[PDB]
Amino acid sequence: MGFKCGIVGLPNVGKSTLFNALTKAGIEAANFPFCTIEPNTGVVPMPDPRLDQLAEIVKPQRTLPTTMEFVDIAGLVKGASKGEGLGNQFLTNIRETEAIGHVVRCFENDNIIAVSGKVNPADDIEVINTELALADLDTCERAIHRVQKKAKGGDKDAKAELAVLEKCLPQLENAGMLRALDLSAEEKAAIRYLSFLTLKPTMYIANVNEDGFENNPYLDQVREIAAKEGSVVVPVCAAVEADIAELDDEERDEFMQELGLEEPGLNRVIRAGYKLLNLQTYFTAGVKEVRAWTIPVGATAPQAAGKIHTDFEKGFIRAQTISFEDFITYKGEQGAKEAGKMRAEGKDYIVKDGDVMNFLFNV
């Protein structure tokens, strides 16, 4: 399974070019095992300085970078959340994902014409959020119908579930977001399985002109809303990302130096989606390959190893986990052994980001 952030948004905002250039960033699956490309399943790789910095010392034969997964949520009409077939399909396509990336056109363009005719991030954002809010209203009303009769039966767990649902309901009736509520961790636990749509974190993908990265009223409104909802933003230019997709390495370097961009905004979307879900990556060092491995934050060494192979979990005994600072500054594994910066990590320690590790199992 992949940690997935569905790309949603209104039509004629520049999302099409955006995920086209995102797919163009994807690697050909002819060399990566188990990688199957559905036309809308966008599996994109990690431009990672850490892994090549490791490879500068470990010097592996190949490199296996980790990748994330994206869903293009295409096809949208107003009023879709009343249970229409296309509305159900849109809602289901969002449901199976883990986070939401909402795209907002933030650049003036008379050749890109919208249904409103007026460029306004606020009302477009409000429209799509109201759609998802009505969907979650339907889901939530079904939920209280299911749970109130159980809680009347004395079930304390269903009681707490009922309290959380009753606090959620007026937000959805008010077409409001569940992320705007002060919900504690156990309330999140209680209503995690209902998979509330507005509850998942969102990243505001603001499509803007090349020269409009600043001094932009549309960016101003997007930033304001993202601050209010505690969501993050990422400013991108469809033309710039499309060119980066259309250019090979040296001409891409030339173009990024032309525009004064230290690193492209597609990398920013990658990092936003990656860090939004509270997940990290560690590194395994080898002569065959140094591989970056993606786990949720807090997953143990046995659990991360089982994510590799179940024998590495069940038989796990100990791991030699090295912090990346002590790994780099002492120039590789042998320098680490000479400095003694290793960790004989057992099963209970929580994996930290980027730690160079070696896994020992017994099956």
């Binding site: 109130q148 009753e166 007026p170 937000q171 008010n174 705007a180």
Partner: protein
């Protein structure tokens, strides 16, 4: 007094719609920021109406962002731009203060279908 009646009458709004306790209403009020002036919408259940001519007021209760908010509008003040009844509720009290104890399911008000 006739004097105060005349003074108040020449100030009263003419287009105040009919609404009753239990009605969900949306009250469009004026918010003045810097110099610009815009409409802000407060939609909620009318839980109380005070009828005193120019001094008529009504209380609207909503659950905004998981927090109960009651706003008491002065019916004839210019700050209240408009009132629109979005739903007619069927209650029997004149003052629905008991909704201050209600949450979600118990807070539904039957629709006055007539």
């Amino acid at each position: 007094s006739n004097i105060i009646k005349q003074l108040e009458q020449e100030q009263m709004k003419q287009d105040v719609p009919s609404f009753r306790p239990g009605d969900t209403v949306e009250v469009k009020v004026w918010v003045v920021e810097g110099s610009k002036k815009r409409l802000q919408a407060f939609e909620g259940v009318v839980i109380a109406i005070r009828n005193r001519g120019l001094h008529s007021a009504f209380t609207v209760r909503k659950i905004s962002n998981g927090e109960g908010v009651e706003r008491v509008f002065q019916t004839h003040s210019p700050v209240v731009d408009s009132i629109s009844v979005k739903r007619r509720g069927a209650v029997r009290k004149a003052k629905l203060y008991y909704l201050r104890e209600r949450t979600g399911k118990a807070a539904r008000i039957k629709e006055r279908l007539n």
